[PDB]
Symmetry: C2
Amino acid sequence: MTKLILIRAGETEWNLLGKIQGCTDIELTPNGIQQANEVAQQIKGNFDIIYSSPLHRALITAQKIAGDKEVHLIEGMKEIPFGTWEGHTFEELNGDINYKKFLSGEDGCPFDSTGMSIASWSKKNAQLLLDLCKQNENKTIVCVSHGAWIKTSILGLLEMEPTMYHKFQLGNTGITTFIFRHGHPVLTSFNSTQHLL
Amino acid sequence: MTKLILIRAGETEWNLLGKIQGCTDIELTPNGIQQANEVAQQIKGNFDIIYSSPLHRALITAQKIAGDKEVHLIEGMKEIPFGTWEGHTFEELNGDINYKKFLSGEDGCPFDSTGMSIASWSKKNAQLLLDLCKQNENKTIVCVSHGAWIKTSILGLLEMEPTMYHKFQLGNTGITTFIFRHGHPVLTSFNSTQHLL
């Protein structure tokens, strides 16, 4: 009954460049809008309620999916801040100490100098998503958000070590779904992208 | 680049009952065959080599997908034996000590009285798939196999605790994909089933 659907925002120019957006409010590419429409077509109108991050790339994606429904903004669902890392590619971060930890597992995998980590964001976002699911018990919930945000959410809900973050790759408009088999969540799909051409 | 595609076999009557097949060679339902067509239609022959479990439910699904190509049998790809538990639902196993261990984590989560577990199958199936990937370095490899076999493969490739098995739910003709970034495997999709009508 209670079904959770996590959808990554559509494509942006910074995505194509490998440029870390984080909180930077970059707009969709024309292809990123096509992606939003194709994922909107896949979902049809199935969900009961749809939430979104307020960032444009996410919000526009959610509005295509929503069709006639309201899109409920959730600031908490905004992309994880990458701080100083924002504006750079990962290749440029090679001489960063916190990036060396981010990969290794040290200090729960720090996001630059944001004071926060894969470990903290996992607990935090998981707790958010669980509260939403309680709020909408026995409904199908769609949440449109971002790559880091969604990946930490997955680790959080499933209770996975922070270094598992680097073993999941999540695409633009990638569908990731949970159900709750006991009281705990169960992953039913991850990064389903068959709706794209 | 090396791409791995793990596909679960089509539906059977034992699947609809929640009945544990394991090694028993149950045939597809007419719907299971319709699923096999649909997944074959999605894949569109878009792979370089295809391997399969020799059990009919898997092999027939591989044959639909393969179309023109040869389906390479691998005995090691056959569904994990469930021994004692084969021919039963999970609800029937309530009084089994090994089933309580299978859930909890004890002894690497034993599969009945087979002398084997989620832990041992994880290492073993991980190992097999890596050898297959080495043999076909830089090709797109399809492997048709079964629920438990694929889930243990995921845990083994991603190096996860046996108990995580109960947090993944995989469907008939569910697509699951890996690539290899930095030498190590990265999950790009799990249980993608948008091809099903």
